[PDB]
């Protein structure tokens, strides 16, 4: 079990760690988060009390270094940093734990929610989309735009999510226009899974990473990406049976975890109605259809 210490908490802020969150008051004696489960990527995220504008945060994995948070009064945010002196870090952490100035990652033993939301998400794979190679952790915020959004402006601050476009030469084989537009299996299986992603684990993971950024930061381009990756599967008549079963589980846990009061903005009516009721896979998402109908029957 690993730890992310905080130098201090100089401004009042709501801090999230994965699907959990707690309020820290201005200059409250807070020195970080302990008992973080090893084996998963994690996200630590922030919303200031004075400017709810800009949720921001850091994807990180404790297996790949010792990380801490320190507020920067010039740039006005909580920054993640890596401590390369392992003994200095162990000492800091041990002293903060002894003074009980850390919150404990509050995982219920029964609870597989975070595993289920991050099953195909890794820290190395995440850096392929969020580019800042000098760090081990990755920064994301509410405002960052995607590469595809930028085609339709600062490239270094972009989310390099796989560009999916159903009315594109990549998606449509010359001479199979109607076939490929009405049944996207070519584009799913040859172009994306065999050509770019390499496997289903790659597809599910980028799709999962897109959802989590939409949910935690309200990142609109990430929501667009999540829905496009769902629609591309549901609009393919030929999908490996193991992928459909896994997709149903993935989406079930995403819909389960979504705050009820955010469904209006984070859920696209057209995609979900098309996916659950009209698409080729309208009968292949039993768990997802059941939770959607019992939790958001209005959207449908």
């Amino acid at each position: 079990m690993n730890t992310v210490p905080f130098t201090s908490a100089p401004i009042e802020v709501t801090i999230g760690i994965d699907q959990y969150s707690f309020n820290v008051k201005e200059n409250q004696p807070f020195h970080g988060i302990k008992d973080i489960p090893i084996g998963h990527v994690h996200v630590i995220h922030f919303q200031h009390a004075d400017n709810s504008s800009m949720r921001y945060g850091y994807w990180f994995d404790c297996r790949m270094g010792n990380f801490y948070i320190q507020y920067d009064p010039k740039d006005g945010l909580y920054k993640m940093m890596e401590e390369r002196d392992g003994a200095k870090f162990e000492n800091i952490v041990h002293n903060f734990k002894e003074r009980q100035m850390m919150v404990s990652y509050p995982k219920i033993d029964e609870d597989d929610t975070w595993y289920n939301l991050t099953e195909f998400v890794q820290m190395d794979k995440i850096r392929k989309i969020v580019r800042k190679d000098e760090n081990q952790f990755s920064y994301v915020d509410s405002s960052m735009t995607t590469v595809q959004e930028n085609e339709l402006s600062d490239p270094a601050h972009s989310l390099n999510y796989t560009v999916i476009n159903f009315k594109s030469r990549e998606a449509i084989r010359p001479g199979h226009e109607m076939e490929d537009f009405l049944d996207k299996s070519y584009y799913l299986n040859t172009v994306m899974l065999q050509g770019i992603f390499k496997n289903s684990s790659n597809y599910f993971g980028e799709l999962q990473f897109a959802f989590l950024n939409a949910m935690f930061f309200g990142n609109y381009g990430s929501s667009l990406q999540w829905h496009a990756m769902i629609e591309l599967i549901c609009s393919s008549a030929t999908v490996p049976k193991h992928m459909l079963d896994k997709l149903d589980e993935i989406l079930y846990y995403q819909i389960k975890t979504l705050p009820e009061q955010y469904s209006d903005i984070l859920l696209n009516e057209r995609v979900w109605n098309i996916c659950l009721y009209s698409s080729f896979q309208k009968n292949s998402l039993h768990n997802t259809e059941k939770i959607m109908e019992n939790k958001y029957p209005e959207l449908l």
Binding site: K167, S168, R169, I172, P174, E177, M178, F181
Partner: protein, 237 residues
């Protein structure tokens, strides 16, 4: 964006554009089977592709053989339309290719966009106008060439005959749409108006009668009356 009353003179500027109407592509008669079920029999159709500035009509005849062994024909008809329009564009010299294609029905947008991906600079546009191009098969010479076709065939016409020698494109398009609106609302009456005076003939190389300027004013007036009339017989006013 969509073409409408507000941006109507755009049709007669010097940017090449085509209207595409797919109404008459997939045409059937519905009939009873010996068992008393219902079945369809396709008849030949046509794509109506029209340059509104010049009157040039690219009439692509759709022979019933194209439907053999196919399913979901009404959906296929829109994609076939888009395939043949794309083929026509590719066949034209670069300086004759359109800068915009205006589809008369919104369901043609995605099929045509996908077939024209190779032409990213050709704008595919819908319209808010309720244009009467479905009535093209009420023009006897167009109906005749479609029904007689034994194979896929493109036939070129000028739908304005020689009108542009004497009137502007705007006026020619207005006359055409008036004639076609009349034929659509009451074909028998409309055709009676056009052919009543036997001394006015249709030249072999034309579609419409050889009316003088004064006779066109009378004709146009009679078509307007018909459309209001039938609008009376229909709504009772």
């Amino acid at each position: 964006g969509a073409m409408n009353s507000s941006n109507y003179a755009e049709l007669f500027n010097n940017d090449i554009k085509l209207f595409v109407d797919d109404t008459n592509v997939y045409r059937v008669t519905v009939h009873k089977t010996f068992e008393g079920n219902v079945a369809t029999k396709a008849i030949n159709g046509c794509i109506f592709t029209l340059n509104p500035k010049t009157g040039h009509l690219f009439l692509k005849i759709i022979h019933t053989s194209v439907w053999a062994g196919q399913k979901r024909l009404s959906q296929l008809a829109k994609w076939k339309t888009a395939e043949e329009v794309s083929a026509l564009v590719r066949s034209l010299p670069k300086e004759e290719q359109p800068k915009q294609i205006i589809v008369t029905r919104k369901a043609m947008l995605d099929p045509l966009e996908v077939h024209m991906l190779d032409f990213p600079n050709i704008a595919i546009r819908p319209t808010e106008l309720r244009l009467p191009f479905s009535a093209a098969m009420s023009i006897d010479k167009l109906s005749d060439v479609v029904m007689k076709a034994t194979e896929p065939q493109m036939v070129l016409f000028n739908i304005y005959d020689d009108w542009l020698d004497r009137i502007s494109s705007y006026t020619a398009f207005s006359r055409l749409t008036l004639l076609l609106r009349a034929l659509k609302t009451n074909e028998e009456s409309a055709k009676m108006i056009l052919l009543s005076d036997p001394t006015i003939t249709i030249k072999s190389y034309h579609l419409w009668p050889s009316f003088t300027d004064e006779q066109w004013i009378t004709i146009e007036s009679q078509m307007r009356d018909l459309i209001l009339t039938e609008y009376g017989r229909k709504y009772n006013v």
